[PDB]
Amino acid sequence: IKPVFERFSSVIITSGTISPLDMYPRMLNFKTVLQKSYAMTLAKKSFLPMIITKGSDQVAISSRFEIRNDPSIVRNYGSMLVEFAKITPDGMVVFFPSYLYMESIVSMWQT
Amino acid sequence: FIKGATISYGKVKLVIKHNRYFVETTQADILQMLLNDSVIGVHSFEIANESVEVVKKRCQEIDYPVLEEYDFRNDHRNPDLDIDLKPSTQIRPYQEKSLSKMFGNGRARSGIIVLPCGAGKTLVGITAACTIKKSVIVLCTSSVSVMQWRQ
Amino acid sequence: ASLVASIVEARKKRTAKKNITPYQRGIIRSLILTLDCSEAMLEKDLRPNRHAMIIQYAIDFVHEFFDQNPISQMGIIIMRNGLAQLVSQVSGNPQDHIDALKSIRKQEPKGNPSLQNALEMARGLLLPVPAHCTREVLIVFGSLSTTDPGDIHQTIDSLVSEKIRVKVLGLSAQVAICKELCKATNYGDESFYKILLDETHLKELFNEAVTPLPVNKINKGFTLVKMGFPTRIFEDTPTFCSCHSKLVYGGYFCPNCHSKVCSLPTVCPCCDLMLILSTHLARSYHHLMPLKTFAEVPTTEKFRSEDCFSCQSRFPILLTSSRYRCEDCKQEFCVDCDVFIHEILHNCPGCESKPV
Numbered sequence: 302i303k304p305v306f307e308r309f310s311s312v313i314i315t316s317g318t319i320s321p322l323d324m325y326p327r328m329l330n331f332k333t334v335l336q337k338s339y340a341m342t343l344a345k346k347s348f349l350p351m352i353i354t355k356g357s358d359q360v361a362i363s364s365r366f367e368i369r370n371d372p373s374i375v376r377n378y379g380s381m382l383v384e385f386a387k388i389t390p391d392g393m394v395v396f397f398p399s400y401l402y403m404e405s406i407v408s409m410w411q412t
Numbered sequence: 413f414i415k416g417a418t419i420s421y422g423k424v425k426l427v428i429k430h431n432r433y434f435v436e437t438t439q440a441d442i443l444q445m446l447l448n449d450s451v452i453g454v455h456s457f458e459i460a461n462e463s464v465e466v467v468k469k470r471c472q473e474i475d476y477p478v479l480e481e482y483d484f485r486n487d488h489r490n491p492d493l494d495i496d497l498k499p500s501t502q503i504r505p506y507q508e509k510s511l512s513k514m515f516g517n518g519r520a521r522s523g524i525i526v527l528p529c530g531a532g533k534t535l536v537g538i539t540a541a542c543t544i545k546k547s548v549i550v551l552c553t554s555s556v557s558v559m560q561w562r563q
Numbered sequence: 564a565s566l567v568a569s570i571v572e573a574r575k576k577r578t579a580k581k582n583i584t585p586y587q588r589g590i591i592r593s594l595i596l597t598l599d600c601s602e603a604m605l606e607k608d609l610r611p612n613r614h615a616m617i618i619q620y621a622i623d624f625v626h627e628f629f630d631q632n633p634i635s636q637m638g639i640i641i642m643r644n645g646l647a648q649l650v651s652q653v654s655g656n657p658q659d660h661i662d663a664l665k666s667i668r669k670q671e672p673k674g675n676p677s678l679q680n681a682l683e684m685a686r687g688l689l690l691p692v693p694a695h696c697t698r699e700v701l702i703v704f705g706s707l708s709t710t711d712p713g714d715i716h717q718t719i720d721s722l723v724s725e726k727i728r729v730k731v732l733g734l735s736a737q738v739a740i741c742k743e744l745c746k747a748t749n750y751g752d753e754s755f756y757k758i759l760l761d762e763t764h765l766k767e768l769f770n771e772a773v774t775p776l777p778v779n780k781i782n783k784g785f786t787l788v789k790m791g792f793p794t795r796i797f798e799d800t801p802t803f804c805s806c807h808s809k810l811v812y813g814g815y816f817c818p819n820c821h822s823k824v825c826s827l828p829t830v831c832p833c834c835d836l837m838l839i840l841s842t843h844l845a846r847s848y849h850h851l852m853p854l855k856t857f858a859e860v861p862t863t864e865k866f867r868s869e870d871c872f873s874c875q876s877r878f879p880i881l882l883t884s885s886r887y888r889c890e891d892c893k894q895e896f897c898v899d900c901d902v903f904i905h906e907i908l909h910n911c912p913g914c915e916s917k918p919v
């Protein structure tokens with residue numbers, strides 16, 4: 302990327318989830334005149350970000366690779382998938398850390 | 413009525429070390445009171461193990477009663493046991509409420525727990541042992557109960 | 564401030580009522596009430612259950628619908644086991660629909676819902692309807708998923724081509740098809756898809772649907788409908804009825820063929836001529852000449868009288884004037900009368916009292 306930042310004078314780097322902004326100048330050797338992130342001024346809350354640390358049984362849930370075939374975690378994630386699918390009106394997207402972890406866990410749910 | 417008895421708690425602590433009972437106080441002013449008591453006999457002094465039931469009853473009569481608080485977090489001399497409730501366990505709402513009243517301040521308090529017959533008084537004792545993670549002893553006033561208690 | 568808090572809330576409530584204009588409305592209506600009876604309706608969010616409350620409110624809706632729309636007809640459909648079940652033919656008899664709903668109240672709901680099946684049945688049931696009537700479909704949807712045999716999009720296009728109108732009342736959340744069905748079927752309007760927020764709010768939604776819907780300017784159809792006014796006759800001996808063929812004391816005599824009928828308003832079984840009474844049309848008059856909303860009088864000016872013109876209730880002295888005046892006749896009214904004059908009555912006493 303060094304030739305790009307030298308051949309061109311003005312370059313704009315924009316994205317929806319580019320944070321923290323201080324790291325990119327460190328990783329890629331370039332300087333910026335200004336770097337900021339805008340916060341949406343939505344009158345009414347439109348998205349509900351929440352974090353789940355344990356299942357309905359109060360047991361911690363994690364996607365650690367070493368315990369992928371964990372009977373307790375698989376059920377907890379399986380319960381989460383089913384319960385959410387019951388209330389989601391139209392569409393639901395599930396993102397897994399890696400294909401192999403998804404490939405193994407999906408097989409566990411099938412059985 | 414409330415003023416007289418509500419100010420007594422929280423001035424004298426009883427501690428145990430190497431099977432030796434020490435009446436520990438965090439202020440030096442208490443020495444002029446306890447040591448001068450007719451029945452009795454940061455400063456800490458030893459006391460007979462069998463005499464605990466006597467001083468404790470005396471402590472009720474005198475202004476200041478004693479509280480039995482154990483700082484298991486900072487107690488490293490006593491060996492620890494690694495035991496935790498399995499995922500299949502489900503703590504009922506009332507069980508959590510009882511524990512909160514005991515660990516509200518953060519230091520384990522010795523006391524009594526009253527629950528309906530069959531409500532799970534066994535599990536109440538199990539939770540206390542599991543969370544403390546130290547050597548524990550269980551007394552059950554029966555033989556059939558001991559067998560089922562273990563199971 | 565607590566008393567003022569109620570006053571300002573009333574002003575905010577009155578804000579919506581300020582904008583009232585005589586929109587053209589189709590008095591003659593043909594409604595197809597669709598109720599969802601599926602596994603998703605067994606939840607306990609509505610006590611005792613969704614099915615029980617919906618049926619109970621359905622009976623109330625039937626009573627209210629025919630009370631204010633005497634010259635309208637209604638039909639009831641239900642979705643069960645992924646199929647559309649017909650429980651009442653389109654008719655002008657309120658008792659028939661209520662009886663059918665009562666029987667439905669016993670059977671437990673099960674299976675999955677099928678909107679396409681329900682809409683297809685509604686389309687067929689509304690095919691034999693005069694062009695001068697307004698075709699409306701009230702769907703009560705509770706499930707978040709739809710299982711259908713064919714393409715729902717094609718049915719929606721067919722519904723638009725047939726000039727049908729669909730109103731959907733949800734229970735849990737928004738459904739993409741319901742929004743599209745309520746949008747494409749209502750000329751892009753997005754106010755015909757409503758989701759209840761609590762038990763009480765559901766009552767208002769059902770009551771709101773009673774009022775005739777306004778007609779679109781481009782969808783303008785003008786025609787003359789032939790009708791008759793039978794004269795009630797009292798007979799000394801019972802005679803057979805032309806509708807049910809049973810012994811009845813008496814009935815109204817049709818002026819076109821003299822055939823007698825049991826109850827009104829109904830289409831004559833012989834000449835197929837709609838028979839009505841003068842009262843039946845009179846009720847729908849308020850929808851044609853709505854009474855202009857009263858505007859609160861500011862406390863800055865001087866009031867006319869200390870008591871209400873129509874009820875002679877002394878206006879409390881108490882910050883905010885407790886008086887509402889009518890622009891047409893300039894007569895102050897208390898808060899109580901305005902609600903009564905705009906919900907029970909539909910004529911301003913002050914305007915009538917003024918001579919000309």
Ligand SMILES: Nc1ncnc2c1ncn2[C@@H]1O[C@H](COP(=O)(O)OP(=O)(O)O)[C@@H](O)[C@H]1O
Nearest residue numbers: 501502503504527528529530531532533534535
């Ligand atoms: N959290 C729990 N989950 C399942 N069973 C429980 C639970 N708590 C208590 N029980 C059951 O309650 C019964 C009585 O327990 P026990 O400790 O003997 O009660 P108590 O000593 O209060 O009479 C036993 O069958 C025990 O397994």
Ligand code: BEF
Nearest residue numbers: 528529530531533
């Ligand atoms: F109260 Be139990 F039966 F020990």
Ligand SMILES: [Zn+2]
Nearest residue numbers: 804806807825
């Ligand atoms: Zn009859």
Ligand SMILES: [Zn+2]
Nearest residue numbers: 817820831834
């Ligand atoms: Zn006739």
Ligand SMILES: [Zn+2]
Nearest residue numbers: 871874897900
């Ligand atoms: Zn009045």
Ligand SMILES: [Zn+2]
Nearest residue numbers: 889892911914
């Ligand atoms: Zn008036």
